[PDB]
Amino acid sequence: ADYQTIYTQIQARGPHITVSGEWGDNDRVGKPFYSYWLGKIGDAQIGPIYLGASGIAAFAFGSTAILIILFNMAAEVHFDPLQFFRQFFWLGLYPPKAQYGMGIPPLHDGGWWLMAGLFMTLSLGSWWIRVYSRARALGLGTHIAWNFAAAIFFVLCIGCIHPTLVGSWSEGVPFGIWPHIDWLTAFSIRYGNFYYCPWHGFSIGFAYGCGLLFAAHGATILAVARFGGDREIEQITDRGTAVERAALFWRWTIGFNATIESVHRWGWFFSLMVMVSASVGILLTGTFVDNWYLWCVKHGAAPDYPAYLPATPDPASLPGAPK
Amino acid sequence: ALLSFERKYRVRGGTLIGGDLFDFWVGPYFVGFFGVSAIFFIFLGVSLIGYAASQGPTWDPFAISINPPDLKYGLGAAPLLEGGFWQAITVCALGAFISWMLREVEISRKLGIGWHVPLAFCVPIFMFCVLQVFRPLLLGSWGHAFPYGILSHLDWVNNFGYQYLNWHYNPGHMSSVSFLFVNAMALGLHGGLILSVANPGDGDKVKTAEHENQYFRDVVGYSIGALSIHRLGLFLASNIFLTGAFGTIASGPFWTRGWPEWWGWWLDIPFWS
Amino acid sequence: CFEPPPATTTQTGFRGLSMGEVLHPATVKAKKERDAQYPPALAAVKAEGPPVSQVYKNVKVLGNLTEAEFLRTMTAITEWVSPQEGCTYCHDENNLASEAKYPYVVARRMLEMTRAINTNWTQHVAQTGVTCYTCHRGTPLPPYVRYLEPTLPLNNRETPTHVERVETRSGYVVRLAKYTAYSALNYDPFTMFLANDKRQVRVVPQTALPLVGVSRGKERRPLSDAYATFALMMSISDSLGTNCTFCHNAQTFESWGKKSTPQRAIAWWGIRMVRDLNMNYLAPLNASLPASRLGRQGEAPQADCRTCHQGVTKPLFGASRLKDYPELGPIK
Amino acid sequence: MYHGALAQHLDIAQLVWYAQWLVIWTVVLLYLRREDRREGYPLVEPQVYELPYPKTFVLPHGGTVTVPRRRPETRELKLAQTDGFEGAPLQPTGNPLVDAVGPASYAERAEVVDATVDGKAKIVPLRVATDFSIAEGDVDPRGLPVVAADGVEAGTVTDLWVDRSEHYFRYLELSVAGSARTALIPLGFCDVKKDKIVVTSILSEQFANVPRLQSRDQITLREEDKVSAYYAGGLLYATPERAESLL
Ligand code: BCB
Ligand code: BCB
Ligand code: BCB
Ligand SMILES: C/C=C1/c2cc3[nH]c4c(c3C)C(=O)[C@H](C(=O)OC)c4c3nc(cc4[nH]c(cc(n2)[C@@H]1C)c(C(C)=O)c4C)[C@@H](C)[C@@H]3CCC(=O)OC/C=C(/C)CCC[C@H](C)CCC[C@@H](C)CCCC(C)C
Ligand SMILES: C/C=C1/c2cc3[nH]c4c(c3C)C(=O)[C@H](C(=O)OC)c4c3nc(cc4[nH]c(cc(n2)[C@@H]1C)c(C(C)=O)c4C)[C@@H](C)[C@@H]3CCC(=O)OC/C=C(\C)CCC[C@H](C)CCC[C@@H](C)CCCC(C)C
Ligand code: HEC
Ligand code: HEC
Ligand code: HEC
Ligand code: HEC
Ligand SMILES: CC(C)=CCC/C(C)=C/C=C/C(C)=C/C=C/C(C)=C/C=C\C=C(C)\C=C\C=C(/C)CC/C=C(\C)CCCC(C)C
Ligand SMILES: CCCCCCCC/C=C\CCCCCCCC(=O)OC[C@H](O)CO
Ligand SMILES: COC1=C(OC)C(=O)C(CC=C(C)C)=C(C)C1=O
Ligand SMILES: COC1=C(OC)C(=O)C(CC=C(C)C)=C(C)C1=O
Ligand SMILES: CCCCCCCCCCCC[N+](C)(C)[O-]
Ligand SMILES: CCCCCCCCCCCC[N+](C)(C)[O-]
Ligand SMILES: [Fe+2]
């Protein structure tokens, strides 16, 4: 066994490294501190952290959203603090229950929801600038920011773009532990079973795919740690035995292989395509498709099964049947 | 038919069974004993799917569904057409999967690398066994297993969830979903980070391990490190199914009500009721 | 937090669809024992004599019955509804034709209602039918009733905590939750769907593509309808002690034919029956009941699925007294 | 009915279904599978059209590499075709541990010392990196014996080599008993106990022929490969019956 793949047997300590960027060196804040127990399974150093304006803007905007959500949740239990702690998972901030269309809802029936949504959006946009700009400051590509952008686009699709396209704020995702979960079933029911949305399928293929790829890739690199396989940058610019052994492992198993660079492109693409496929599914839902099951039936794609208990006619359709 | 660096690695050895009787390659593929047994179990399995398909309505491989038996057959054997095919095919499926796992061990040993990949591959084989073998044993019928059709298997997942009113409140499921989400995110960040360093753009220079650590210290105040992100990724992916398995096993044998009602242990504590 | 095996399982769909019931035997056993308390039918009597319509002075419903028969009805009604207080629950000793006690006039309306169930709602109750006992279970107040706002406990024979009481505003979310099988769904499906016939339970379009003129802005039903229908379905499921697959193939909740069991069509008749009971027999009794029996909006207690079923797919596991008491209907 | 009719009224979702599949098969076959072929292609004895133009990297400390590297493979006389069938395993001509073939193979990595961001040597002994220590709580292995596969003590730990970029120990240095020489061992091959270092990968006598560094206080990328590969060779070749089945 390579015990090093499980944990660090002997931890190193040394002076804290700082890589200078084009800007912002003065907005780094805190003294680094080391953690013996973290050091067993990862790097021991916690801190420092960069602030900047995008950082502070994001915390200001985020905190505002959380306070609006928490205050409306406290109101739902009439500010009893014990009931608040008990019922927390069941408490939420809801979009409008009535149909105001794109009408700005009153505060008691969706107005706070729309406030909380706006501040969360400005929080995400500020964080996106932080993720993008830190990459540029250190002379790195912007691959992370474009992945992050797909995730943000998806939250925008379920949060305001879909509601806008069908013309009702009532279709938005409530804030809350169980309430946001309840929306998944309401939305699937309203649109005729999300299992029959092909973009739900694509999204799940890529998500399952991300599990397959990170298990495979994580395990491949631990399997060649003995040969410095974790030093993936210099294995890109100067192929070592680590990534030769890795490539041949996969070539001999499945009959083809990536490079230590290209497998990261596979990883990045599969991750991105979870969010892109999901977004395309939501854009089509309610705009161009009302019932996903009946859409599959219309295209010959839906399976049928024999009766087991007798087929049951719609009573609504029988002669002399009440409303 | 060889990679430019491959020849020096193509030596005899590392097999678990058969000595060098099966110690060879066909094109890029290593064989071994388990390569032969994989092909056996795959050939049986595909034959049975073809035989079953031919006895059924259609040849459209998206409408094909080989289903388990009715519940009344319990753990007994069923007529071929009424779930016998399903039973034969499950055995061949396990045969092929276990063969494939052990083949990866022989390949690992020949290259003198860790066995981490075949060990990781045991996780999905376990979860398949939970769905098709362990949970049906505990409920007393093979009929509780999922059917072999591309679309039909989604209708089984669907009805199984709604047998517990809202499957989303299943605590094992909440854990399983959390790992699936954080894993897909982590793989994006890791993939994106490596590409960002090797490809800064505009004929600028490749960056360093020091730049990797600095990037994440800046953005979230911590960098786990190059080796550790690989161990973490195997950990997050593996835990999708290791936590998921308790949620599936519990549904029927250890819990018969809706999953929301399970949270009664918290909600109905006397002192705040 | 768990229930030990074995579990009892049934099949309600084609093999490999995972459709069917899931039952803890201890829980089935406890309900069977509760429901076994159903008093036996009283010994039958030959129809000797004239009809009580021309013997007794104030019989408006059971007038065609014979003196021995009628007294047999009255002894059944008494053990079913008011065994403790006896005949004097509804009657002045000094005059058995006197309507002076509030329970007498309600009881007459309850006879009309029980006969209307067993006659006009055979599509739901079939040849099993109902007695006074089905709902009342030996008490004047039935143990499972609904007001126009959610109340706890569900069983009115259990004592409320401070937080369960309808006046404690902080317990509302928990009152709502325990009516919807502990879901967080923010809707009262009794007042929305069962108190009257104003709202439609169906929300899912019956076309692949969105119809023009129902699919944009103020012309489309809000998503809150889907949520409300889901909360009714959670309530209906827990009321019968079953799950969605007893009635539906989840492949298409909106489809009949092979995609629904016969139990789903029976449930559809059940929704129509409850609305009839509530609108035309139970809501209007608020004018005949004391204030101590009314809710905070002056409403009479009304019926949901649980009122009869009390956590079983068939009330009292299909126990019938229909052939024992033909005067409770059906009436030709 | 009509010859050539299908039962499909076209809608937007159906259109976007075909387009999505097109985008997926395009990215995989024509971009991802092209990137996959930057190392080891073109293929050899004893593809062409679907290979991309070689890629050029600007290294951190000056210079450029173009991939794939044109450096040739050097351990080709050290293996022999037993058989005429291309699938047949190749047979070593000498001692494969020393000849460095099969799992003892190093890659033709560059004879340069890996560097920190600021141009120092990255992997160096603690006698050089005097600002680096072992964390309070862990075994200082300096002084401890190294026990090989055969139970024999093969040498004593003299130092640890730290990665200065990542703050992570990567090698132990031991004096070999019965020689006037040092050997590096990758920590991945080391079971670190309180009173000893256990090495199951090779026997005691086999530490004699661990690849030697050109220099005492720094190591090249090719040397790191040479050292690491030797011990991995041990897994299959330290004894005759390690390359046999468990039949
Ligand atoms: C607990 C719930 C389960 C579930 C729920 C589920 C959902 C909700 C959805 C899927 C979907 C899919 N599932 Mg499924 N599933 C599948 C396979 C599949 C694929 C047909 C598809 C995409 C999966 C994917 O890309 O993964 C990642 C792997 C990748 C990317 C590598 C490539 C794999 C390749 C595409 C798979 C092809 C398999 C073959 C069609 C089957 C073998 C044929 C034989 C004769 C050679 C297999 C082989 C198994 C087994 C053996 O256990 C399985 C178990 C389960 N699925 C459980 C029962 N699955 C999606 C779909 O679109 O179905 C229509 C989908 O939406
Ligand atoms: C009955 C209900 C169903 C349902 C309803 C459903 C709906 C309605 C939708 C999905 C969607 C999806 N479903 Mg699905 N589903 C899935 C899997 C999936 C996902 C792969 C996919 C994408 C969602 C995602 O990644 O969100 C995780 C990632 C997110 C949410 C991005 C967040 C990023 C953000 C930047 C984070 C920032 C957070 C801030 C820091 C916090 C600050 C907050 C404060 C300020 C308040 C599986 C594997 C199964 C199985 C096995 O059965 C299944 C069954 C069902 N789904 C049922 C059929 N599902 C989505 C989809 O693909 O539609 C086509 C979708 O919209
Ligand atoms: C209405 C129904 C619900 C439902 C019902 C459900 C059930 C019943 C179960 C899950 C489970 C799970 N659900 Mg889930 N679900 C999930 C996510 C998930 C998964 C993380 C998890 C595990 C999946 C699994 O077992 O794969 C299994 C995959 C396997 C076994 C793959 C094996 C592969 C094999 C070894 C190799 C096969 C090789 C190929 C044949 C080769 C051929 C390819 C080529 C080479 C030829 C999300 C993200 C959502 C959302 C967003 O709402 C959701 C909603 C729902 N789920 C609905 C609410 N879900 C499972 C779980 O863990 O629950 C706790 C589970 O049992
Ligand atoms: C397939 C693609 C995947 C994907 C991809 C990516 N995801 C990324 C990136 C990429 C590429 C980044 O680059 C970025 C990042 O940086 O990585 C470290 C990021 C992120 N993904 C997060 C969460 C996440 N991703 C999810 C999903 C997927 N992601 C999908 C699966 C999910 C799910 C599944 O739900 C979650 C929950 C955050 C950690 C982070 C955004 C932080 C933010 O935008 O900040 C908002 C900023 C805040 C500061 C607000 C919150 C803090 C408050 C103030 C705390 C204090 C409260 C206090 C004031 C109240 C007290 C009051 C009183 C008592 C006194
Ligand atoms: C948490 C851990 C994750 C994980 C991990 C890992 N995953 C790995 C490894 C690791 C480490 C490997 O090393 C191995 C591999 O080589 O990588 C390329 C592998 C693999 N993961 C595959 C599929 C896969 N992974 C999934 C999930 C996860 N993976 C989870 C997420 C999922 C889903 C559904 O999510 C799918 C579909 C294959 C491509 C491959 C096995 C090939 C095989 O075994 O060949 C041998 C078998 C055949 C070639 C065919 C057998 C035909 C049988 C007899 C007849 C049909 C059987 C019947 C069941 C069909 C009905 C289908 C119906 C439902 C429609
Ligand atoms: C309320 C639940 C009742 C209880 C308990 C008992 N009786 Fe009753 N009784 C009730 C009603 C509503 C009526 C009128 C029925 C109708 O068809 O309109 C009656 C009627 C009688 C009569 C006839 C009296 C008359 O009109 O002259 C008798 C003799 C009678 N009831 C007797 C009786 C006895 C003996 C009871 C205890 C065994 C008893 N009743 C209980 C309502 C209720
Ligand atoms: C469920 C579908 C019912 C059946 C069948 C019967 N009753 Fe009923 N009853 C029901 C409700 C919801 C209520 C209102 C709550 C209340 O307790 O008032 C009642 C009421 C009565 C009463 C008044 C009791 C009181 O308030 O003190 C009486 C006397 C009564 N019901 C009698 C009765 C008889 C005799 C029945 C069989 C013929 C009968 N009920 C059937 C619900 C249901
Ligand atoms: C029988 C005892 C049922 C159980 C259990 C569940 N449902 Fe149901 N459902 C039932 C009926 C009779 C009806 C139709 C009511 C009417 O008046 O038309 C429904 C309706 C639905 C719908 C809406 C369908 C539509 O056409 O729009 C949905 C979405 C639905 N049911 C879902 C559902 C779920 C999720 C259940 C378990 C929680 C469930 N139902 C149980 C009968 C029965
Ligand atoms: C008392 C007046 C009842 C009320 C209120 C409801 N139900 Fe009912 N139900 C009742 C009886 C006496 C019977 C038995 C008929 C029989 O088949 O024995 C039933 C039956 C059903 C069934 C069928 C059960 C099965 O076939 O196994 C279902 C699915 C059902 N009932 C559902 C249902 C719902 C959803 C109700 C609220 C809207 C409801 N019932 C009310 C008596 C009474
Ligand atoms: C026209 C005008 C004026 C404005 C336009 C408005 C606009 C653009 C609105 C957009 C609204 C959007 C995008 C809404 C999206 C809502 C979504 C997706 C909600 C999803 C989930 C919510 C959840 C999980 C809420 C949980 C709430 C709590 C836990 C209470 C607070 C505590 C926390 C957030 C900490 C939990 C920790 C967790 C984040 C890991
Ligand atoms: C109902 C509609 C939903 C359908 C379900 C969605 C399936 C998942 C999607 C994409 C996976 C892409 C798979 C990529 C696998 C690689 C194949 C390959 O690389 O080909 C090898 C060839 O030898 C090279 O030369
Ligand atoms: C496991 O269950 C738990 C809850 O509900 C189910 C909580 O509400 C809470 C309270 C949470 C907050 C944020 C106040 C905790 C801590 C918890 O552990
Ligand atoms: C080489 O790869 C990586 C790291 O090492 C420098 C990280 O620190 C991290 C950051 C990890 C955390 C927990 C912030 C990621 C995602 C990564 O991919
Ligand atoms: C969420 C806490 C972070 C811990 C993650 C790392 C744990 C490693 C120890 C057990 C798993 C070891 N592994 C992956 C080689 O099997
Ligand atoms: C999507 C809208 C974004 C919100 C705008 C507020 C964020 C402020 C960002 C400051 C800019 C940082 N800096 C110095 C790198 O330019
Ligand atoms: Fe990596």
Numbering used by the authors:
A (entry chain MMM): 1 to 323
B (entry chain LLL): 1 to 273
C (entry chain CCC): 1 to 332
D (entry chain HHH): 1 to 46, 58 to 258
Q: What wording appears in the published article?
A:
In purple photosynthetic bacteria, photons are absorbed by the photosynthetic reaction centre (RC), which is closely related to Photosystem II but lacks an oxygen-evolving complex. The RC from Blastochloris viridis (RC vir ) was the first membrane-protein structure to be solved by X-ray crystallography and has been extensively used as a model protein for studying the light-driven charge-transfer reactions of photosynthesis. Subunits L and M of RC vir each contain five transmembrane helices that form a heterodimer supporting four bacteriochlorophyll cofactors, two pheophytins, a nonhaem iron and a tightly bound menaquinone arranged about an axis of twofold pseudosymmetry. The transmembrane domain of RC vir is capped on the periplasmic side by the single transmembrane helix-containing subunit H and is capped on the cytoplasmic side by the cytochrome subunit C, which contains four haem cofactors.
One potential advantage of crystallizing in LCP is the possibility of adding ubiquinone to the crystallization setup, as it easily mixes into monoolein. In the SFX LCP RC vir structure, a second ubiquinone-binding site could be observed on the same side of the protein as the QB pocket but closer to the C subunit. Specifically, the ubiquinone binds within a hydrophobic pocket sandwiched between Phe89M and Trp263L.
